[PDB]
Amino acid sequence: KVKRSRKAPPDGWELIEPTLDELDQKMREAETEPHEGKRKVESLWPIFRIHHQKTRYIFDLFYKRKAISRELYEYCIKEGYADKNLIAKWKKQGYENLCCLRCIQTRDTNFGTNCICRVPKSKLEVGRIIECTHCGCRGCSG
């Protein structure tokens, strides 16, 4: 992301910058991935995951490692590296391993429910294939 907010990043940026650059490269590579050989929705699967992974990286640096400052965290939020809504959902209980925001958007589904991946494996069928259509995860529940 060469295009930034016309300033200098806060202190501690260079510590995490190479990992963000690698994630940005992965995201760009996923964008340009040809959609032949896959289904219609599977081509959108990597972006979600990368985004989730990307949003993990900042979320594991401000709460579970405390490795970045508050201003750096907000700079990462404002630059599109971190997802404010996804992080806000993760702070809740039972939403720690939430894959994407779409899997809990109630009225996106036909019946005002969640995605199938939201169903916990405890009350799931033993050995069923769990392949989400929105993002393709094996069950993002607890």
Partner: protein, 208 residues
Amino acid sequence: EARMKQFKDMLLERGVSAFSTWEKELHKIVFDPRYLLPKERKQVFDQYVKTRAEEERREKKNKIMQAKEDFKKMMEEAKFNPRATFSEFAAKHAKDSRFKAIEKMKDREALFNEFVAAARKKEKEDSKTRGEKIKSDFFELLSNHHLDSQSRWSKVKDKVESDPRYKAVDSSSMREDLFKQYIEEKELERQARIEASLREREREVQKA
């Protein structure tokens, strides 16, 4: 102790550091036999994280010092290289390890340009400040004698020449001009500027 050493080796060998998630490298480090050799892993990871947070700031400081050293090598390997181009400063300073440590040569050119501009501005400001100090010293030395419009520069030359303050002025014509200017504390100056504004407004409106 061997378990902690193995944990550190696993954290440093698999392309991991304090800037890579444990829950993201867990799929690449769990298969290591050293991983098997709760809280001990967490404590070791936290200690390594703190030590590496200090060490990364130290390494950034080292890189900044390397940039400063590259600038110093490009600037102080010759007669200050004021107007020396990139080729001139490169052909004379391409051997030492200070420049060879810099992996990028474009960084060297950008640092040389920025530091040269900053040093030119600083040198101009320092020269101007020294000139101001010399002018103040010369004015103070000239004021030591009861001089007015009737006083001549010939007597100033005969009674103020030996003063080191007058020696700061390297030109006799400049000294004579300064003497002529001098021959022809702040809040009251503020009121003087207010009066200046009043008189300029008065002349403008009076002409109109």
